[PDB]
Design an enzyme around this catalytic site. Structure first.
Site, short mmCIF file in Angstrom:
data_model
loop_
_atom_site.label_atom_id
_atom_site.label_comp_id
_atom_site.label_asym_id
_atom_site.label_seq_id
_atom_site.Cartn_x
_atom_site.Cartn_y
_atom_site.Cartn_z
N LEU A 166 0.75 -0.98 -0.11
CA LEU A 166 0.08 0.00 -0.07
C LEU A 166 0.90 1.19 -0.11
O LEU A 166 2.00 1.09 -0.01
CB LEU A 166 -0.91 -0.04 1.18
CG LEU A 166 -2.09 -1.26 1.18
CD1 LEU A 166 -2.81 -1.08 2.66
CD2 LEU A 166 -3.29 -0.27 0.54
N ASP A 167 0.30 2.49 -0.16
CA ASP A 167 0.85 3.56 -0.26
C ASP A 167 0.52 4.36 1.19
O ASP A 167 -0.26 4.22 2.04
CB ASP A 167 0.33 4.58 -1.47
CG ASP A 167 0.59 3.80 -2.61
OD1 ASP A 167 1.40 3.03 -2.84
OD2 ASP A 167 -0.19 4.23 -3.46
N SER A 168 1.58 5.22 1.38
CA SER A 168 1.43 6.08 2.55
C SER A 168 0.07 7.03 2.53
O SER A 168 -0.64 7.08 3.64
CB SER A 168 2.47 6.95 2.55
OG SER A 168 2.92 7.93 1.35
N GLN B 299 -2.21 4.34 3.73
CA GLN B 299 -2.20 4.69 5.23
C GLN B 299 -2.87 5.75 5.73
O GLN B 299 -3.61 5.65 7.08
CB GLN B 299 -0.76 4.48 5.59
CG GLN B 299 -0.62 4.15 7.03
CD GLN B 299 -0.04 5.38 7.85
OE1 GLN B 299 0.34 6.26 7.14
NE2 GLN B 299 -0.63 5.49 9.17
#
Ligand SMILES: CCCCCCCCCCCCCCCCCC(=O)OC[C@H](COP(=O)(O)OCCN)OC(=O)CCCCCCCCCCCCCCCCC
Ligand SMILES: CCCCCCCCCCCCCCCCCC(=O)OC[C@H](COP(=O)(O)OCCN)OC(=O)CCCCCCCCCCCCCCCCC
Ligand SMILES: CCCCCCCCCCCCCCCCCC(=O)OC[C@H](COP(=O)(O)OCCN)OC(=O)CCCCCCCCCCCCCCCCC
Ligand SMILES: CCCCCCCCCCCCCCCCCC(=O)OC[C@H](COP(=O)(O)OCCN)OC(=O)CCCCCCCCCCCCCCCCC
Lengths: 88, 60, 176, 63, 51, 78, 114, 125, 459, 168, 156, 304
Positions: A42-44, A47
């Site tokens: 996933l990406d920040s 998140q």
């Protein structure tokens, strides 16, 4: 009208629930330690969205400095338990 | 409960208050000064056995 | 409320926090969930449009412009969760958050009840006058002699040693 | 006493609904009783005569 | 005393002191009136003041 | 007391304004990964549109009924 | 309305609310009768009325207060009286409106005399 | 666009000092943080330290009180605008109020002497 | 009167030949009995005043000062007890003797008939105060504080003596009520203007005028609690008594030789109530409060009206009690934290939930919450000055506002935040100091119930 | 209570005319009050008055002989000035009480008349204005240190001007 | 216990003094800046940003929390007015220059329009009210023995 | 209502001062408008209710200025019932949820909490002026006298604009708290089945329904009203409340439609209170305190 106290298994249920509802990556396969980048990639930004969903679920804010370090449902549950003072 | 509370929180105070009024507030001249009671034609006063006469013919 | 800021925030952190605040103010503006989701997806598209860029100067410029756009389009009465700053419950139970040392002055006829409680409180001290000296050495010995220092703390590397400077993170009162 | 519910519409006792329905029905009964017997108070009971519809005989004005 | 029930909240106290301030500003005029009446009527009772 | 959580295999976008929002985000070429969360509302006991009439004319039925009853009783009693 | 007719149109041929009885009263009235008073000063003072209230309708107001003090535990039994008082006050208002219109017509007379 | 003021300050976002990546900036930030952390470690070696019966002192608070209280006159120097501020603040308002009250009193007294006043019911003073 | 003074003189041997364990107890009990006996003065069934000798006398103005003086003593005994606890038996007996001497001299100078006896006693009040402040203070500026106090007082007092001699020569006596039944008008000349200045400056200094208030904050901040209490309660009242007694002969000069002091009082009121907003030392804050309150007394003596004098007396007694109470309240903390800084300790009312009430009521009084004698004085001073000139109400309202501000500031920065949890040395509240606060308050309730004993000469 | 000092005019109370058929609580409530509050308190006051009657005591209103005034009091002899000043203070206090009586007599009339106080409360207002004028001429601008001598100086500073007015 | 070398002093006129001052106040000799020399008692005390205590981070676990200020940190000479129960310098979406203008405009326009409506009032078309006995001359104070200037109220 | 009680007690002296009555009429009305405006863009139930209280108080000051003290007091007394029941239902909703007052995170109350929804609707109607729910018996007479008397023709207008903003923000409450979807957290422990909560509101609602009748039909007639006027004055309050309700319905349904909310200065003003606090509570303290410190304590006392 007083609401019931929290439980660690309850927080686990709710977190895994929200993450199952999540769609962008999670193929409904989430163990307690399904790291977002390593195990799920996933990406920040995702998140950020995840932490905001946790907040909209539980009713309180996660300071950004401490949310920039949460990448596992177990870490989320631990932070929430430390904040709500559970398992007396 | 209603009745015992009534007694012990209304009556006793009410007795003390009636005593105070009757014997330390009406014995003095200007402590209880009521306004005057409205009087209208036909109202026959009782302190003098008097009767005031009615009004005039109402045009209509 | 559990860590300390670093000497400087990085571009990544700045952009992430801007995204979070922008989304919170989008929520404030759009009261309905459908609208919120619509415009949140739109905003994330606006963001992702510049994720594979690397020119640091143009990146900082885009950020300096986006922050101004935010200041110009921000909701002035945003939603703040109650127990958080600006919320209707921030610092509401500090009246009842009484510390622990307030029990050393209690009177024997007060701790006469809760006797099983105060016995534990005792041995919780025995666990403190012993675990103190080695918590200092672990800091002395784990010191950076090159001058550099920050607000972090290490754990204990033994069986029996305890994290240095624990008594106040432990023992603190409930939130209620 | 009650059982919390999650992401669902909770179980509803009968008192809290019947009492609200009763209060609302009473309010509307009152509104209707009143608007029936004392309608004037919201509409009017004393017309506003048309100025200049009088006669110069009254409000005498010589020519 | 009631706005301030939660005397750890650093905004309830601001509100309490705000109320105190404004109500003292009103008490200024209240005392002005009391003074005017005490001098020009040698009284503070509605009865005399009604003259 | 032990709390339960219903299956997540029922909170579906189908038949809600989330679906129209999805139509729009597809017209623009995008997807929403969270709609199934917000979709716990918009369906079930929370389903249906409430109206200003719905809230204002509550009780009106029995109110009017008892009004007419009392009116008839008044006409009777003269 | 008079508001417009005064503040925008001719403001000198429209009356002023504070100078209504200005002109002589009988400029168009021969043997103009007086407004009568069928309530006596004592009958009005022993009832403890108010000086904004002991006007030309204090007699019906007296009947109202009487029928109210009586039949008291049952209010709403003072409607036929309340109607009479409201009507007399309405007729007084009518007389005032007619005075206003009279004075406006006399202003018309003065502006048509030249 | 946001015009900053000394009462509605400029935020950190719009401060070009932020987003500065110069070493003369980041090094200074690191040094400031190191000082902050050294002080926090010092203070926490006293907070949680057992065998502590007393409270903790604040040399910064002591310095602040001593400066605002007793280090004033030893550094005071008479200057222009200083003598002037002092003289004005001290005397001006007194003169203003003196003339206000004196005019009022004289007017009242001449009125009373002439008898042109109404002192009905004044029987207290 | 001698039945009040002889036992006060006997409290000394009692103190010295009492055992090192019962001296405090015995002297305090007997001081309370003295306070009790002093109520004979309140048996005033006629408008005639008391005259026990050619040397003593009592009035409706000197009786309350005397009774407050005889009452404050055991309170000071109790309050000076925790400190100088380790100090030697001899030293603490010295302290007690100082207190008792102050009591006796203050009673004498309130019951005096002759201005020169009043003078020698109003100037002998210096030795014990100076000794208490210099021998039992904790800082190093108590010496300079005593210098300031002593010498302000003496510089103000010399010309008063000279004026008293001039009078004793022109007239043949300094006796009161003879100086009244024989007083003459004056010539409004410069010599008599300087006579006015002389007679007044001593008292205008002993109750701090705005410009010469630079001995009170020092003395308070540097002095122990008993010194602070007596200074705030009675030493600030000697000037008021002296002026109320000496202004009878200076007619008709004070009609025009009083403007400067009225101005200074009405302005320094504001200019000290404002310092009470931005001072860090609690003791100096309360000192400036005392100053802002004595300004009203000054301005009310200056205008010479019955309502004015009544308010002056009421506020004198009320402020005495309230200032003593506030000083003792701050001392309770100092004994626990050894720092007069206010913002240091906060969030109390959690561990000291009752003393937070005493803190609150002492504040309700200082900000003139009705029904209270603080207000029954302020109101009448305001009315008198409004009759004087209607434009005084402006400054009066400004001062009222600032008072309501800084009282609640003092309350909230100490009792209404969240705790300084790092304060392990907060020994719970002593019965002794709770009793101090109760003994301060209750008499205010009683004097608010019966304020006929507190109006003064006029009423 | 002397009704001459405190008038308390009579009370014109009318007849209750219950032009209805529905009862009135106030009447039965007053009867219940008379039965359960009055009766016992009246008995108790009767008992207390019995004890009084059987152990009565009397107290007298002190009389004050008149002494010389300031007028026949020399300019420096204090044995006379003391007597005169005490007498003056005594009369000043009695005058305070007289004015307070007048005001206590006016408030009652205002409250009684109510809306008719502008027409039926005039003689009391006139007595008040008159006694106010007198108090003003006697004691208005003396000062905190008021005394018979200052009152005399006021009297003379008034009478000289009145004499000038008389002659012209 | 403290010492004259730990307490403040007079204006530094050398870097030999600025160094010791900044190391005492626990700042770095660059960020340290003393107050100008206008003879006002300041001396060598830090000159720090005029920012309040609202600006600071609420999420940090400070030492002095109500003040939002650490232990040895140098304290602002004007803390008593920035202690967070008082003056707030925290920024605002709208700007001083425009908010003051908007408020002044609202107030002044409303006042001007009050005056406009006073010059041009609103009322109803009727004559003044009529009270029989000479506008109630007797009841309305009057004087019984004297007579009033009689006035008449006619019909229609 | 303490100041209004003061002024009614002292009405025998305001009857003959057309400078006091005229600053009343021109000040109270300045609050009906300035607060309702503020009550149109706030998100807190408590703040909304407080601003509405301030508006009603301005209305009572207006009817004091127009020489109707008994009417002002009647409003004082008929206002308490519903302005207390409103706070009551607000607190019920709050304690049911997790201590949140922001309407933007609640909804469907009409169904998840019938009792408080009904009582809130009753209070809102009584406040708006529904023909007989304790609002009428005072507000109708007030809004009739306002236009029947000789008055200020700008107050006579802004008073009614605010009387409409009343229904505006009441409809806002109704729509964002009791008509939309449940945008509150998912955990639900609602419980309003406690007598200590059900009976007080039931009682205050009986009050809010019948107090105006019971009083107005028993009190004495200390003032003659004007029942003679055109329909466009006799029905203005009702008509304009209805128009406010409708305008609010429209502008709130516009909250949907996927049209972003471009901030504007009007709304920013109404939201930030006209900046009265944001500026006054920052200049006046700064001046007062910088003076207290640098001038008196430093320059005068410790220096000169
Ligand atoms: C409290 C404020 C009002 C109290 C009034 C005094 C009542 C208590 C009392 O002691 O009554 C004494 C009464 C004689 O009192 P008095 O005529 O004034 O003689 C001079 C008194 N030194 O003689 C008596 O003892 C008769 C009364 C004794 C029985 C107690 C009566 C209770 C009084 C309650 C009503 C007082 C008003 C309460 C108002 C409360 C205001 C919040
Ligand atoms: C156990 C503790 C004891 C404390 C006392 C307990 C009882 C309570 C008494 C308190 C109330 C009284 C307080 C006021 C006392 C003042 C009255 C007084 O002392 O009068 C003086 C009197 C001397 O009377 P004298 O006329 O001078 O000489 C004739 C000798 N037969 O001398 C006396 O009468 C002596 C009075 C004693 C005062 C103590
Ligand atoms: C830091 C402050 C300064 C400290 C140093 C002080 C320096 C002292 C001043 C130098 C000496 C100047 C004074 C000389 C006194 C002259 C005599 C005099 O003024 O007396 C006149 C008056 C009596 O005159 P009269 O009764 O009318 O008839 C003729 C006499 N049978 O009787 C009187 O009026 C008595 C006058 C006594 C002197 C009064 C001094 C001024 C009073 C106001 C200020 C007081 C404060 C201390 C002095 C400040 C500086 C003047
Ligand atoms: C047609 C008419 C239209 C015009 C009408 C004009 C009417 C007159 C208006 C006068 C009132 C304006 C001055 C009021 C000062 C208010 C100060 C204040 O609000 O204090 C509280 C403030 C914090 O409050 P806040 O900003 O809301 O922060 C909330 C954070 N969530 O910050 C504080 O805590 C400060 C605490 C007190 C600071 C000391 C104050 C000293 C006294 C100075 C104020 C008094 C000056 C006189 C005001 C005028 C009256 C003469």
């Amino acid at each position: 009208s007083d609401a019931p106290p929290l439980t660690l298994d309850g927080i686990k249920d709710r977190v895994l629930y929200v993450l199952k509802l999540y769609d962008k990556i999670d193929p409904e396969k989430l163990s307690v330690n399904s790291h977002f980048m390593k195990d799920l990639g996933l990406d920040s930004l995702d998140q950020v969205e995840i932490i905001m969903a946790m907040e909209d679920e539980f009713g309180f804010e996660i300071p950004d400095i401490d949310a920039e370090k949460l990448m596992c449902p177990q870490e989320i549950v631990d932070y929430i338990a430390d904040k709500k003072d559970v398992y007396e | 409960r209603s009745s015992l509370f009534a007694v012990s929180h209304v009556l006793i105070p009410m007795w003390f208050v009636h005593y105070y009024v009757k014997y330390h507030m009406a014995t003095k001249p200007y402590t209880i000064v009521s306004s005057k009671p409205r009087i209208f034609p036909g109202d026959t006063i009782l302190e003098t056995g008097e009767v005031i006469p009615p009004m005039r013919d109402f045009p209509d | 409320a559990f860590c300390a800021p670093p000497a400087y925030l990085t571009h990544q952190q700045k952009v992430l926090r801007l995204y979070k605040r922008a989304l919170r103010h989008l929520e404030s503006w759009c009261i309905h969930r459908d609208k919120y989701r619509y415009f949140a997806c739109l905003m994330r598209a606006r963001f992702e449009e510049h994720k594979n860029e690397k020119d640091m100067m143009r990146a900082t410029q885009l950020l300096r412009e986006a922050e101004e756009e935010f200041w110009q389009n921000q909701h002035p009465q945003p939603y703040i969760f109650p127990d958080s700053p600006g919320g209707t419950s921030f610092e509401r139970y500090e009246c009842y958050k009484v510390p622990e040392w307030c029990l050393d002055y209690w009177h024997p006829s007060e701790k006469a009840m809760y006797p099983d409680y105060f016995s534990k409180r005792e041995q919780w001290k025995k666990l403190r006058m012993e675990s103190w000296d080695r918590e200092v050495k672990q800091l002395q010995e784990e010191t950076s002699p090159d001058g550099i220092m920050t607000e972090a703390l290490p754990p204990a590397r033994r069986e029996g040693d305890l994290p240095p400077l624990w008594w106040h993170i432990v023992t603190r009162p409930r939130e209620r | 006493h009650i059982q919390p519910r999650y992401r669902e519409f909770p179980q509803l006792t009968r008192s809290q609904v019947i009492q609200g329905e009763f209060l609302s029905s009473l309010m509307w009964f009152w509104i209707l009783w009143r608007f029936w017997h004392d309608s004037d108070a919201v509409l009017g009971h004393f017309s506003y005569p048309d100025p200049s519809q009088w006669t110069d005989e009254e409000l005498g004005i010589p020519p | 005393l009631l706005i301030g029930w939660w005397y750890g909240r650093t905004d309830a106290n601001t509100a309490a002191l705000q109320a105190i301030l404004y109500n003292r500003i009103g008490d200024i005029g209240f005392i002005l009136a009391m003074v005017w009446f005490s001098l020009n009527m040698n009284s503070w009772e509605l009865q005399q003041i009604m003259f | 007391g032990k709390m339960e959580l219903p299956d997540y295999r029922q909170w579906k976008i189908e038949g809600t304004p989330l679906e129209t929002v999805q139509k729009k985000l597809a017209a623009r070429g995008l997807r929403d990964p969270w709609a199934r969360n917000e979709a716990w509302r918009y369906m079930g006991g929370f389903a249906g549109n409430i109206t200003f009439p719905s809230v204002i004319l509550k009780g009106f039925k029995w109110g009017f009924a008892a009004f007419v009853v009392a009116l008839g009783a008044e006409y009777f009693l003269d | 309305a008079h508001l417009t007719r005064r503040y925008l149109w001719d403001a000198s041929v429209e009356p002023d609310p504070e100078k209504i009885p200005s002109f002589p009263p009988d400029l168009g009235f021969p043997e103009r009768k007086e407004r009568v008073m069928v309530a006596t000063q004592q009958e009005m003072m022993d009832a403890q009325l108010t000086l904004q209230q002991r006007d030309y309708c204090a007699h019906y107001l007296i009947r109202l207060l009487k029928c109210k003090r009586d039949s008291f535990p049952n209010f709403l039994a003072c409607k036929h009286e309340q109607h009479d008082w409201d009507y007399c006050e309405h007729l007084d208002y009518v007389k005032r409106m007619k005075e206003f219109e009279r004075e406006r017509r006399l202003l018309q007379r003065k502006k048509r005399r030249a | 666009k946001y015009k900053p003021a000394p009462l509605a300050t400029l935020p950190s976002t719009l401060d070009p000092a932020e987003y500065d990546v110069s070493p003369e900036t980041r090094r200074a930030q690191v040094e400031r943080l190191s000082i902050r952390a050294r002080l926090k470690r010092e203070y926490l070696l006293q907070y949680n330290d057992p065998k502590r019966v007393s409270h903790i002192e604040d040399p910064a608070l002591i310095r602040w009180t001593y400066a605002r209280s007793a280090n004033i006159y030893p550094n005071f120097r008479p200057t222009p605008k200083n003598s002037l501020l002092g003289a004005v603040a001290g005397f001006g308002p007194l003169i203003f109020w003196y003339y206000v009250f004196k005019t009022d009193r004289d007017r009242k007294e001449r009125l009373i002497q002439e008898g042109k006043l109404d002192r009905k019911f004044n029987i207290s003073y | 009167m001698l039945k009040i003074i002889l036992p006060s003189l006997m409290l000394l041997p009692l103190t010295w030949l009492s055992s090192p364990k019962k001296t405090w107890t015995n002297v305090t009990s007997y001081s309370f009995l003295i306070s009790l006996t002093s109520l004979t003065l309140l048996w005033q069934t006629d408008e005639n005043y008391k005259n026990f000798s050619n040397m003593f006398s009592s009035d409706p103005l000197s009786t309350p000062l005397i009774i407050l003086t005889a009452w404050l003593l055991p309170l000071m005994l109790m309050a000076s007890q925790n400190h100088l606890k380790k100090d030697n038996n001899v030293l603490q007996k010295l302290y007690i003797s100082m207190l008792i001497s102050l009591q006796i001299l203050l009673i004498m100078t309130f019951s005096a008939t002759e201005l020169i006896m009043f003078y020698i006693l109003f100037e002998a009040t210096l030795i014990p105060t100076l000794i208490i402040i210099t021998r039992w203070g904790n800082q190093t500026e108590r010496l300079n504080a005593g210098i300031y106090f002593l010498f302000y007082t003496l510089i103000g007092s010399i010309p008063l003596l000279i004026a008293l001699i001039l009078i004793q020569n022109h007239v043949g006596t300094l006796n009161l009520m003879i100086l009244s039944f024989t007083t003459h008008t004056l010539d409004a000349s410069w010599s008599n203007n300087l006579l006015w200045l002389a007679c007044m400056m001593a008292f205008l200094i002993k109750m701090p005028l705005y410009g010469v208030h630079l001995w009170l904050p020092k003395a308070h901040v540097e002095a122990p609690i008993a010194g602070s209490m007596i200074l705030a309660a009675i030493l600030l009242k000697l000037g008021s008594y002296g002026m109320i007694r000496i202004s009878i002969i200076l007619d008709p000069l004070t009609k025009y030789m009083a403007y400067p002091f009225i101005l200074l009082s009405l302005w320094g009121m504001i200019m000290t109530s404002s310092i009470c907003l931005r001072q860090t030392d609690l003791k100096s804050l309360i000192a400036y409060s005392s100053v802002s309150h004595m300004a009203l007394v000054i301005a009310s003596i200056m205008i010479q009206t019955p309502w004015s004098f009544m308010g002056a007396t009421m506020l004198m007694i009320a402020h005495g009690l309230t200032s003593s109470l506030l000083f003792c309240l701050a001392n309770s903390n100092y004994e626990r934290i050894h720092s007069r800084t206010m913002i240091m300790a906060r969030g109390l009312q959690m561990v000291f939930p009752l003393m937070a009430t005493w803190w609150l009521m002492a504040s309700l009084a200082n900000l003139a919450l009705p029904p209270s004698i603080n207000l029954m004085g302020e109101l009448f001073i305001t009315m008198s000055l409004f009759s004087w000139s209607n434009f005084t109400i402006i400054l009066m309202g400004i001062n009222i506002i600032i008072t309501g501000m800084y009282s609640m500031y003092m309350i909230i920065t100490t009792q209404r935040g969240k705790l300084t949890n790092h304060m392990i040395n907060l020994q719970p509240s002593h019965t002794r100091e709770l009793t101090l606060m109760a003994l301060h308050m209750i008499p205010l309730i009683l004097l608010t119930t019966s304020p006929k004993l507190i109006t003064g000469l006029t009423m | 209570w002397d009704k001459d000092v405190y008038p308390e005019p009579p009370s014109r109370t009318p007849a209750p005319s219950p032009q209805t058929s529905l009862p009135n609580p106030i009447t039965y409530l007053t009867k219940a009050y008379d039965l359960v509050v009055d009766w016992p308190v009246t008995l108790v006051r009767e008992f207390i008055e019995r004890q009084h009657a059987k152990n009565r005591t009397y107290y007298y209103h002190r009389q004050y002989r008149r002494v010389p005034d300031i007028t026949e009091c020399k300019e420096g002899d204090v044995l006379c000035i003391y007597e005169a000043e005490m007498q003056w203070r005594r009369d000043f206090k009695v005058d305070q009480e007289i004015m307070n009586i007048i005001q206590e007599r006016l408030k009652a009339c205002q409250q009684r008349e109510g809306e008719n106080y502008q027409q039926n409360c005039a003689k009391e207002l006139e007595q008040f204005t008159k006694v106010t004028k007198a108090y003003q001429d006697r004691y208005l601008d003396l000062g905190a240190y008021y005394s018979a001598r200052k009152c005399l100086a006021k009297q003379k500073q008034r009478m000289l001007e009145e004499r000038k007015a008389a002659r012209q | 216990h403290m010492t004259k070398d730990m307490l403040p002093g007079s204006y530094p006129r050398t870097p030999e003094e600025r160094a010791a001052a900044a190391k005492k106040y626990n700042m770095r000799v660059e960020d340290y800046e003393p107050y100008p020399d206008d003879g006002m008692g300041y001396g060598d005390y830090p000159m720090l940003p005029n920012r309040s205590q609202h600006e600071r981070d609420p999420w940090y676990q400070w030492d002095h929390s109500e003040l939002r200020m650490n232990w040895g940190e140098p304290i602002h000479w004007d803390l008593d007015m920035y202690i967070r129960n008082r003056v707030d310098t925290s920024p605002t979406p709208v700007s001083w220059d425009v908010m003051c203008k908007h408020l002044f405009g609202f107030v002044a326009f409303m006042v001007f329009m009050f005056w406009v409506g006073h010059v041009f009032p609103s009322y109803q078309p009727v004559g003044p009210k009529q009270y029989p006995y000479n506008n109630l001359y007797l009841e309305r104070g009057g004087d019984p023995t004297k007579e009033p200037e009689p006035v008449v109220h006619y019909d229609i | 209502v303490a100041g209004i009680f003061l002024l009614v007690r002292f009405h025998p002296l305001t009857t003959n001062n057309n400078f006091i009555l005229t600053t009343m009429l021109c000040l109270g009305a300045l609050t009906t408008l300035f607060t309702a405006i503020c009550a149109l863009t706030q998100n807190d139930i408590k703040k909304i209710i407080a601003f509405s209280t301030s508006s009603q108080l301005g209305l009572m000051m207006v009817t004091l200025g127009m020489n109707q003290p008994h009417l002002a007091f009647l409003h004082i007394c008929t206002h308490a019932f519903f302005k207390a029941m409103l706070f009551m239902c607000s607190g019920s909703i709050i304690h049911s949820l997790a201590d949140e007052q922001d309407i933007r995170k609640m909804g469907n109350i009409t169904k998840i909490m019938p009792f408080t929804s009904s009582c809130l609707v009753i209070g809102s109607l009584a406040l708006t002026g529904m023909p007989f729910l304790t609002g009428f018996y005072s507000k109708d007479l007030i809004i009739e006298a306002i236009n029947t008397c000789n008055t200020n023709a700008w107050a006579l207008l802004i008073t009614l604009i605010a009387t409409s903003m009343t229904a505006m923000y009441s409809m806002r409450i109704i729509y964002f708290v009791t008509m939309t979807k449940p945008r509150f957290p998912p955990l639900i422990s609602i419980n309003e089945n406690d007598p200590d909560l059900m009976n007080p509101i039931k009682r205050l609602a009986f009050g809010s329904i019948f107090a105006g009748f019971v009083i107005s039909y028993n009190i004495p007639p200390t003032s003659i009203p004007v029942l003679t006027m055109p329909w466009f004055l006799k029905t203005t309050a009702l008509i304009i409340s209805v128009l406010g309700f409708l305008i609010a319905l429209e502008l709130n349904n516009l909250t949907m439609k996927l049209s972003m909310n471009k901030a504007n200065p009007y709304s920013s003003f109404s939201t930030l209170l006209g900046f009265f606090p944001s500026i006054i509570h920052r200049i006046t303290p700064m001046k007062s305190l910088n003076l207290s410190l640098k001038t008196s304590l430093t320059l005068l006392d410790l220096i000169w």
